[PDB]
Amino acid sequence: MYGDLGNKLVLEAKRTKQLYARSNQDVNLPMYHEDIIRNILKEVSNLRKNTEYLKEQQQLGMLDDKVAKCQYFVTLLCMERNKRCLLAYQRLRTDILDSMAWNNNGLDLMSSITFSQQDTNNLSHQEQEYLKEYCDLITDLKSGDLVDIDLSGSLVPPSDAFIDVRVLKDAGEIQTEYGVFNLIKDSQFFVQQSDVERLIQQGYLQLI
Amino acid sequence: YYDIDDVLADGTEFPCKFQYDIPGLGYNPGRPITKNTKLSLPLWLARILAIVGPVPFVELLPPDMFSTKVMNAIKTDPVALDLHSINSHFFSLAIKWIMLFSEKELANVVSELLLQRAQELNHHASSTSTFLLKLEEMEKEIYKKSHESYKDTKRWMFK
Amino acid sequence: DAVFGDRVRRFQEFLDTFTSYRDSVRSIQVYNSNNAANYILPHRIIISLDDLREFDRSFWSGILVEPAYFIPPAEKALTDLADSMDDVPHPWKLSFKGSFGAHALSPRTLTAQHLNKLVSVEGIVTKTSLVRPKLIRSVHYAAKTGRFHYRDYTDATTTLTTRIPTPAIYPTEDTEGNKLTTEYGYSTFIDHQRITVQEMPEMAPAGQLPRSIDVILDDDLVDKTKPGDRVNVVGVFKSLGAGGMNQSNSNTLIGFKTLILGNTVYPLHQMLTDFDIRNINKLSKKKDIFDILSQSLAPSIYGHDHIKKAILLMLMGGVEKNLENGSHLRGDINILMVGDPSTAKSQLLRFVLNTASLAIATTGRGSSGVGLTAAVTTDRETGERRLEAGAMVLADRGVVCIDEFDKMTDVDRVAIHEVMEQQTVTIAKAGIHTTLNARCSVIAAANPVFGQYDVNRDPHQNIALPDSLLSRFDLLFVVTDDINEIRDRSISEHVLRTHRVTIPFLRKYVQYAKERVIPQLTQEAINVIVKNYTDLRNDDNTKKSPITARTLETLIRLATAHAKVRLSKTVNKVDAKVAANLLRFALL
Amino acid sequence: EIPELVPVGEMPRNLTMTCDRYLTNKVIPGTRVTIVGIYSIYNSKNGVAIRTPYIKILGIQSDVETSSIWNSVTMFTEEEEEEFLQLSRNPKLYEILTNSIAPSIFGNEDIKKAIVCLLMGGSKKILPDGMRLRGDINVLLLGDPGTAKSQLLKFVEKVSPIAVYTSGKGSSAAGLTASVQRDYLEGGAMVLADGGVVCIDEFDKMRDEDRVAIHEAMEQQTISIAKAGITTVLNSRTSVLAAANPIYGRYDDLKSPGDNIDFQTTILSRFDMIFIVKDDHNEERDISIANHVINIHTGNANAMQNQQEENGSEISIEKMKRYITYCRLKCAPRLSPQAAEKLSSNFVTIRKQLLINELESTERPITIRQLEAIIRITESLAKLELSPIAQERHVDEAIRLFQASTMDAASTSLSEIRRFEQELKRRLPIGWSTSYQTLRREFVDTHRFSQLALDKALYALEKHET
Amino acid sequence: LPAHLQQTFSPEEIQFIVENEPIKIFPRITWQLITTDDKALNNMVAMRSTEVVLWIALLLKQQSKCSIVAPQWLTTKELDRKIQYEKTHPDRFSELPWNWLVLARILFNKAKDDFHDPIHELRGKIQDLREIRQIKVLKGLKYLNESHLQLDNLSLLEINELRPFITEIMDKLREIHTASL
């Protein structure tokens, strides 16, 4: 009853892992809960308020009682508990997030972060600032190599090395890089793994 | 810690009675809590109250889950025993309580139970039925990981 | 079969190291000899499966996997240890507690992987086949050649293991040609029964029909369970009978009916010591106790202090007085409650029931007629006309409850007249012709006899159940939930507070009070109740009705009851005043 | 064999089949299947020779859809938690649900909402001592036909996760709920449908002996059966939804609102939400319903509105059920203190005001049971939002809703038949040789007297004092 | 963020690895190329065996410009001595190329027509040697203790399939036991 709201919150955190697990991974997190954590923050503010109040009270009334210690001990733990929840949730949220910023940006010619992440505005803007700052953070890693990467893609090794892509209602032709593949619905291109990696992440290509 | 299983593991209630009186009850209008009151506490706070004292603040009365009836029943047929009903956390939990109370006796017991489940879980690692329903949450997670390695290695086996 | 010997020498060791069972066997051997020195205990030693794993896992897995080869050598070993006990001046039985299980199964999940393996079934037991003897040891006497001659009969359920069937009849001139008379009462008969077990109704999956299997209960186990009881049986799961393969007709495909032998049958769901009686004794002197007691009944119910007072005064009940060579005057007090619904009238009665020490509850119509044996007809069986106690015979010396007392057919009421005052039941049925005694105390709750006009409506025409009945009941209490506005708010507040000198000492307080001691009667009081009574007749017969000598009787019963509450060896004037009070609130 | 083909005019034959080993208990009775197996014959003396046919099965395969199991899993899938928790975020969630139940049925919004708050269960307390309060409530649809209530029940029966529609007197061979049959509990409505919804009709037309059983059951959720060799005391967690049929029509409203069911209102006292309804006709509404039916016949294409409601907003009702199961098992709601005191004010105003109303002996009621009902509605609706905690406005709905129920609790005679005086007088000073019998012969061939009519006029005159 | 798997290798990744093993080839051909890691070759002579890395043999086999040699250990008459030697030492897993599963998948997709008696034989043989060996692993897995195991000679794929399982419940098992002293 004391710290249990955090147990319920992480209990809810669990279900997003369930949605990232088997899964199938489309992202589409329901929302970030600002309300329930606001409840948590009001509860914890309550706590630390009574804490500094009693911290004033030992200075006068309690007179360093053996019992007093407990309040600064036990209730202190509760603060930690909320923290233990609040970060555990939060890191989970960053884990479901940064990976998404990994596997697709997105990809050639990124060329900008847009239309991605169906959560969009529904997810908190505090995370989105972190996010845009994070893909800005990875643009520098993109700019060191020079390898080249091409890192966001090709988690799965090339074979061999030409494939066949069957158009999937995409228009097209938007293939400007390397060559004008001239995208055309109902058209399969006997194209090398090279531009396939880049174009398959967008949603144009279908069968590898 | 950050993983959900641990922070959820700390959420479980234990029957721990107070060694001492503590006015300023945070649970309601006592105001103090009379000595030797039996109050259920989650593990997170109760964990370091047994250490800090040279007499500790709490007795640590053994949880109903660890009742010697149970620790006996798990020595018969673990494979048919239902863990998911009792807690459901066991290994995530029991691992803490074995260190907290520093009990040697049951190590040899649970160290056995977990082999006996697993010699069964390599059996459902091959491609459920009812059984998948009675695993402990964390154990269950390992079942995902194994079943996925197998499934993926089979899907690689052909085309 | 040296291996059966191995099983015996192996089970030997298990006992006496550790010795934790041996003390119980010794206890069994001693207690019966103590009954031999006096001026019943089944001989079986419960074996906790708990302990078996510590010694040998090999022998542990066996009792579950193949009990036919294991339980009987362990058993012969237990007898063998019981004979080395002390001393001279029977097969016994194993039990198997557990430490379940595997083998944990409800009856719905069973057959065949669980067959020929120990099993703990659980479910409802019906219909409980009727208890019957079963022959085992044949015993005879030869003359004049003498000696002593015996045969041993092996049935289908003998031991565990299958054996070449001995039955049937009697040996009758075993060689040489000497006559053999059956010796009855030396020869051994183990009782025998079977009871089928249905799976628990609440764990039933679908509209799919319930699957029950039958359990044979050997020896002591017999008559240990009425039907409809939650039961966890244990036993070896046995398939007996040919499937039809025995003969040469085939018949059909149906076959091998199965059942469980033995074994345990664990069911599942006063003492005043030194100090208690002292608590009473201390508490008896305090002058205000009656009100506290009267409040102790109703944690959940507001006011009605008068009525609660009444229910106590029924629990105690005016002793009983049987004159020399003459009829006896009724001791106990009967009560009725009438008021609009929500009056807790049906809620009160259950709490009457719990702490009541007995008795049976009956609600409207009804059964078993409540009256006499009811002359149950017809047959049951063969056509023989039999009868059984009505609904006030098995409740003797107790508190009968009646709910929706108005809705009961007049036919019954006619009998209730005979029950209440007269105090006896008379059955001329067919038949067994007897006057048998039901001296029960009685409570009844009835509605407002049509039309909520219970509050405003006349002193008569409101009750709906004339006439003598109205009198028979010592006290008629009215319960119109009518404000009394300032009374409504208070009640609401009370209920709210609820939505969030004890209860276990009450009945203990009561029994001692009941058999000790009867207060008799005293000339302190009599003039009071006489004044009162005469007042009642003379003034109330203008005010209201009914009033008769009956009222007077009631006056005395109440006086004596409140005397019991005071624990006083005598009746007092104060008590008389109390009786006065409650009979007043009855009337006004 | 299947009813589509080929019954013709004759009852369809049934071949006896023996499954064995691992195919056993593979199929729930009532599900269509396709068997394979050998075909063969067994003897079974019943000449000459006449051996009877059976089909050994190897091996059985059920149809893809038809209760293959397990359609009832206390956990469901994942994406379902996702989309549920997406539905909990709707402001019009309550409102859109109240539009799911009766796509076909028009009007009746109070009933329409009441069903919702019924299905969702309520506060359930196991608190010591053994006494346990329960959920969830009860609903009465009683009124003249055209109310669609008897159809509406068919709908609730569909939606509710586990439900049994029994109108009786039960039907047909299965006793009204829990039933004693001999080889034990034979399992019935109150039983076979334990832990959920039960739908009853002709509630006033039910037998006596089991009527007792019901009355005692609905409050304490447990029914005790002492029949023969089984004295069992089981448990019915069901919440009864009953539709009674009122007598003589509109005059019964002119009559005291209670007094309808048998001679006793106690039934109506046990029941928490009583809705008097009627097949009211308004040219606006009547043209609405009519035009709707004209649309229904052909050209047929109206039932699509539900489907675009599904695309845009509304719930498929195949999902609603899963949802109800979800909310039902997951979370158990609890009321807030200010809401509590608010309801205290509610109920004391009720008690006081309506007492004042009954100073005149105005014939009609108020029980703390009704309060408890109001509570269970609040928790039900709280369990709609899914929130672990109640709110004030949340209840503010409930008070008014139940207020509509009170309005239902609130709502001359020719005396022709009641003119039993003529007979009682100048006919029979001794009343004998007449009684209920005389009234018949005298009113039997007079084109005239109903049982309730005869008793009413009798009870009337009994009471009237004539 | 590798996402999947991540602690264990991917089934594909172990082929990605094994294709780095060289094996002999029979080139039809008679630039340069230095590439990087190859070191080979002077222009390959037709009807002359030579040693090259796998992924290039496979690459040049899709164009059917080269005929891969069968490994001396891939034969049914050869496998026979191996299952014979395997049934008779229920404890040890014998002698394995360590890639044999994955080469058994790869060389059968394309090169199949090059093998002598490839049809309906060897696949029957290795699907078997991949049976009794697997159950022998599951029955050798009961003896689990921390910290040691002899997995002796065991395929890379066989390692990879059961890895999360073993190295997880070893991390529940050893975790109580280290910590209880």
UniProtKB/Swiss-Prot annotation, chain A:
Keywords: Cell cycle, DNA replication, Nucleus. The keyword Cell cycle applies. The lineage of its organism: Eukaryota, Fungi, Dikarya, Ascomycota, Saccharomycotina. GO terms for biological process: DNA strand elongation involved in mitotic DNA replication; DNA-templated DNA replication; double-strand break repair via break-induced replication. Required for DNA replication. Functions as part of the GINS complex which plays an essential role in the initiation of DNA replication by binding to DNA replication origins and facilitating the assembly of the DNA replication machinery. Required for the chromatin binding of CDC45. The gene is PSF1. The keyword Amino-acid biosynthesis does not apply. This is DNA replication complex GINS protein PSF1. Component of the GINS complex which is a heterotetramer of SLD5, PSF1, PSF2 and PSF3. Interacts with PSF2. GO terms for cellular component: CMG complex; DNA replication preinitiation complex; GINS complex; nuclear replication fork; nucleus. It holds the Pfam family Sld5. Present with 1431 molecules/cell in log phase SD medium. It is found in: Nucleus. Belongs to the GINS1/PSF1 family. It comes from Saccharomyces cerevisiae (strain ATCC 204508 / S288c). Disulfide bonds: none annotated.
Swiss-Prot record, chain B:
Transmembrane segments: none annotated. CDD domains: GINS_A_psf3, GINS_B_Psf3. The keyword Nucleus applies. Pfam families: PSF3_N (PF22466), Sld5 (PF05916). One of its GO terms (biological process) is DNA-templated DNA replication. It is found in: Nucleus. It comes from the Eukaryota. The keyword RNA-binding does not apply. Keywords: DNA replication, Nucleus. One of its GO terms (cellular component) is nuclear replication fork. InterPro entries: GINS_A, GINS_bundle-like_dom_sf, GINS_Psf3, GINS_Psf3_sf, PSF3_N. PANTHER family: DNA REPLICATION COMPLEX GINS PROTEIN PSF3 (PTHR22768:SF0). Present with 2205 molecules/cell in log phase SD medium. Belongs to the GINS3/PSF3 family. Functions as part of the GINS complex which plays an essential role in the initiation of DNA replication by binding to DNA replication origins and facilitating the assembly of the DNA replication machinery. Component of the GINS complex which is a heterotetramer of SLD5, PSF1, PSF2 and PSF3. This is DNA replication complex GINS protein PSF3. It comes from Saccharomyces cerevisiae (strain ATCC 204508 / S288c).
From Swiss-Prot, chain C:
GO terms for biological process: DNA replication initiation; DNA strand elongation involved in DNA replication; double-strand break repair via break-induced replication; mitotic DNA replication initiation; pre-replicative complex assembly involved in nuclear cell cycle DNA replication; premeiotic DNA replication; silent mating-type cassette heterochromatin formation; subtelomeric heterochromatin formation. It catalyses: ATP + H2O = ADP + phosphate + H(+). A motif (Arginine finger) lies at residues 471-474. Component of the MCM2-7 complex. The complex forms a toroidal hexameric ring with the proposed subunit order MCM2-MCM6-MCM4-MCM7-MCM3-MCM5; loaded onto DNA, forms a head-head double hexamer. Interacts with CSM1. One of its GO terms (molecular function) is single-stranded DNA binding. Its EC number is 3.6.4.12. It is found in: Nucleus. Changing residue 345 to A: No effect on MCM2-7 complex helicase activity. Loss of MCM2-7 complex helicase activity. Reduces MCM2-7 complex helicase activity. Belongs to the MCM family. It comes from Saccharomyces cerevisiae (strain ATCC 204508 / S288c) (Baker's yeast). This is DNA replication licensing factor MCM3. ATP binds at residues 339-346. Present with 35100 molecules/cell in log phase SD medium. Early fractionation of eukaryotic MCM proteins yielded a variety of dimeric, trimeric and tetrameric complexes with unclear biological significance. The MCM2-7 hexamer is the proposed physiological active complex. Residues 289-496 form the MCM domain. It is an enzyme of class 3 (hydrolase).
From Swiss-Prot, chain E:
One of its GO terms (biological process) is DNA-templated DNA replication. Component of the GINS complex which is a heterotetramer of SLD5, PSF1, PSF2 and PSF3. Interacts with PSF1 and SLD5. Belongs to the GINS2/PSF2 family. The keyword Nucleus applies. It comes from Saccharomyces cerevisiae (strain ATCC 204508 / S288c) (Baker's yeast). This is DNA replication complex GINS protein PSF2. GO terms for cellular component: CMG complex; DNA replication preinitiation complex; GINS complex; nuclear replication fork; nucleus. Keywords: DNA replication, Nucleus. Functions as part of the GINS complex which plays an essential role in the initiation of DNA replication by binding to DNA replication origins and facilitating the assembly of the DNA replication machinery. It is found in: Nucleus. The keyword Plastid does not apply.
